[PDB]
Design an enzyme around this catalytic site. Structure first.
Site: not given
Ligand SMILES: Nc1ncnc2[nH]cnc12
Ligand SMILES: *[C@@H]1O[C@H](CO)[C@@H](O)[C@H](O)[C@H]1NC(C)=O
Length: 246
Positions: A71, A160, A163
Site C-alpha cells: 500500500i 496480508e 498473501r
Molecule cells: N504498506 C504496506 N502494504 C502492504 N503490506 C505491508 N506490510 C508492511 N507495510 C505494508
C-alpha cells in the site's frame, strides 16, 4: 480496480474481495502452483486501485503496488495521502493526480514506523471487518496518529489476507467481532519475504529450503519450515514476492 463494501459484508463477500485482489495482481509464472509476482511494472500499471466503502457508503481508494502488494497511499474525497518513502513518492506521480491537494504522511509504510506512530504494536490492535470499517472512516479525515492505527488495520485486512489464506480466514472469523491478530498471523506477516525467497530457491534444490523459515503455529508453538511439502507452502501462501525484489 477491485472493490469491497462493508455494508452487508459477510465472510463470503469478504472472501470474494480477497479473491478479486489476488486475481488483479499480474503474473506470468507459477512457482509450486503459487503465482509469482512480477519483478517490475512500468508506469501507472504498477498500481492497483482498491475502492473500499465503509458501512455508511463513504469511500476511499487505496493504491497498491502489484509487484509486492504494498500500500503506497490512498484517496479520501479530494485529498490524496502517501507514505513518506521513495516508492510512495514515485506512486504519487501516477495515481490520484486529480486530487486538489496531496498530503505526505509523517511516516513510512513499514510496520516498524507505523507502530511507533500509532503508539502500539499491532499485537495489541484488534483487527476484523468492524475494525476495517473504523479504518476507512478514520482515513476519510486527516489525523496522522489515528491514521497510523487505521493503516495497520487496513494493511492486515487487505494485503496480508491476500498473501496468506490463513490471515484471510482469521479476518473471516472476525467478521462481526474484532480481535487482536494471533501470534501465527504476526509470524506469517513477518515471514512473507523469507518464505517467498525460500520457495523460489527450492526450485533447483528439489523442493528443499536453502535456509529454514521459523514460524509460530495455531497453538502458539514455534516450528521450522524446511521444504515445499509444508502446509504453509501447499495451502497457506497465495502470492510470492519475486527474489529480484528481496
Ligand atoms: N504498506 C504496506 N502494504 C502492504 N503490506 C505491508 N506490510 C508492511 N507495510 C505494508
Ligand atoms: C519436509 O518437511 C516435513 C515437515 O513438514 C518433514 O517431515 C520432512 O522430513 C521434510 N523433508 C525433507 C526431505 O527435508
Amino acid at each position: 480496480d477491485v472493490s469491497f463494501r462493508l455494508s452487508g459484508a459477510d465472510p463470503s463477500s469478504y472472501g470474494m474481495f480477497i479473491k478479486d485482489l489476488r486475481n488483479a495482481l499480474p503474473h506470468t509464472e507459477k512457482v509450486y502452483n503459487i503465482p509469482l509476482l512480477l519483478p517490475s511494472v512500468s508506469g501507472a500499471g504498477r498500481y492497483l486501485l482498491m475502492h473500499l466503502f465503509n458501512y455508511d457508503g463513504n469511500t476511499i481508494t487505496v493504491a497498491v503496488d502489484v509487484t509486492n502488494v504494498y500500500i503506497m497511499g490512498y484517496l479520501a474525497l479530494t485529498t490524496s495521502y502517501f507514505f513518506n518513502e521513495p516508492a510512495a513518492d514515485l506512486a504519487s506521480q501516477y495515481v490520484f493526480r486529480s486530487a486538489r491537494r496531496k498530503i505526505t504522511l509523517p511516516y513510512s509504510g513499514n510496520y516498524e514506523r507505523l507502530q511507533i506512530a500509532a503508539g502500539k504494536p499491532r499485537e495489541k490492535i484488534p483487527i476484523g471487518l468492524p475494525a476495517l470499517d473504523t479504518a476507512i472512516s478514520t482515513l476519510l479525515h486527516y489525523d496522522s496518529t489515528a491514521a497510523a492505527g487505521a493503516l495497520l488495520v487496513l494493511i492486515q485486512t487487505t494485503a496480508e489476507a491476500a498473501r496468506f489464506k490463513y490471515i484471510e480466514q482469521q479476518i473471516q472469523e472476525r467478521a462481526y467481532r474484532d480481535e487482536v491478530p494471533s501470534s501465527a498471523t504476526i509470524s506469517l506477516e513477518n515471514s512473507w519475504s523469507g518464505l517467498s525467497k525460500q520457495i523460489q530457491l527450492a526450485q533447483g534444490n528439489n523442493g528443499v529450503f536453502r535456509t529454514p523459515t521459523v514460524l509460530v503455529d495455531s497453538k502458539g508453538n514455534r516450528v521450522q519450515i524446511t521444504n515445499v511439502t509444508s502446509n504453509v507452502v501447499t495451502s497457506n501462501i497465495q502470492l510470492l514476492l519475486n527474489t529480484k525484489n528481496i
